[PDB]
Design a protein around this ligand. Structure first.
Ligand SMILES: CC1=C(/C=C/C(C)=C/C=C/C(C)=C/CO)C(C)(C)CCC1
Length: 175
């Protein structure tokens, strides 16, 4: 009975870019297809004078070579008609890192403790997502209380992603 069409997903009402600013530690992720950030993932969001949001993110990536590297990423976000839906242009500090443009949706956040992000890269003809990624972020590097765990779990179910996330660890590889 679950509607899994991307157009059906609810996103954060009246999303506030300034309140979302600062440091977020990725706690868990749902992988898309292909090359992606693996672990030790930390993003810092900021908003300029003109309200333009950008972010930096660091994380370990394993290259097609099996070459392990600490990627230093940059992203710039373009606002849309829905405050919680952006277009994210990204690139690496290193020329060999992937560059792209992804949808960047803030599904839910309380700004102070957690955030659930989503991106559908490829849709099926039926409107459902064929290739998606999702991060769960925390403000506190130690993670969340069981009560917040419950809220996150529900959002995971609502995106049709239950049981598809794995824990992201932080062990100083990129420090
Ligand atoms: C930039 C940006 C993000 C996405 C980074 C990604 C998608 C990087 C892919 C990197 C790899 C693929 C390197 C291999 O060459 C996330 C959503 C975490 C939030 C903050 C800023």
């Amino acid at each position: 009975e679950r509607d899994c069409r991307v157009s059906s997903f609810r996103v954060k009402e009246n999303f506030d870019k300034a309140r979302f600013s600062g440091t977020w530690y990725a706690m868990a992720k749902k992988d898309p297809e292909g090359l992606f950030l693996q672990d030790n993932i930390v993003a810092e969001f900021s908003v300029d004078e003109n309200g333009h949001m950008s972010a930096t993110a660091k994380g370990r990536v394993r290259l097609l070579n099996n070459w392990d590297v600490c990627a230093d990423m940059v992203g710039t976000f373009t606002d849309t008609e829905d405050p919680a839906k952006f277009k994210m242009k990204y690139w690496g500090v290193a020329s060999f890192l992937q560059k792209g443009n992804d949808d960047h949706w803030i599904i839910d956040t309380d700004y102070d403790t957690y955030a659930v992000q989503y991106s559908c890269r490829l849709q099926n003809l039926d409107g459902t997502c064929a290739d998606s990624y999702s991060f769960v972020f925390a403000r506190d590097p130690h993670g969340f209380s069981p009560e917040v765990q419950k809220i996150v779990r529900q959002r995971q179910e609502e995106l049709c992603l239950a049981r598809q996330y794995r824990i992201i660890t932080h062990n100083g590889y990129c420090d």
